[PDB]
Amino acid sequence: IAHGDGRRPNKQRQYIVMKACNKHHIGAEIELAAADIELLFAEKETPLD
Amino acid sequence: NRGLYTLVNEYSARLAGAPATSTTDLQYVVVNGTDVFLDQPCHMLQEAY
């Protein structure tokens, strides 16, 4: 604001605010039993398999 | 001591006779009046509460 008093008319100030990026990591663990992987690729022909 | 219409014109325009400072530690006397906003009514009426 331009003022009408006797003090020093202060110049504007440009601030340079320098931010960052907070990183985060999320992970969940999933077990698969070995008797489940084994009969996934196994050849099947009977109606029970 | 003057007429009380000129006291009303003095009450808003002219700053009074040496009030305190604003935002200091030890409450100094005000000087140079750059941004000074003091409305004291205990000076004209000459009383204290």
What 3-state DSSP class applies to B29?
strand
Query: Of A13, A8, A5, whose CA–CA distance to B35 is shortest?
Result: A5
Q: Which of B34, B36, B37 to mutate to test the interface with A (most CBs of A within 10 A)?
A: B34
Experimental method: cryo-EM
Burial of B11 (0-12, 13-18, 19+ CB in 10 A): middle
Give yes or no for a contact between B4 and B37, defined as CB atoms under 8 angstroms apart: no
* Cα–Cα dist A18/A32, whole Å: 46
Give yes or no for a contact between B33 and B15, defined as CB atoms under 8 angstroms apart: yes
Segments in chain A forming alpha helices (H): 34-37
Handedness of CA A28, A33, A36, A41 (dihedral sign): positive
Question: What residues does A33 pair with on adjacent strands?
Answer: none
CB contacts, 8 Å: B15 with chain A: none
Handedness of CA B19, B24, B28, B34 (dihedral sign): negative
Question: What residues does B20 pair with on adjacent strands?
Answer: B29
Place of tokens 């000459």: B46
A7 shares contact with chain B (CB less than 8 Å) = yes
- What Rg value do the Cα atoms of chain A yield, rounded? 35
Resolution of this structure in Å: 4.3
Q: Which residue in A has a C-alpha nearest to residue B35's C-alpha?
A: A5
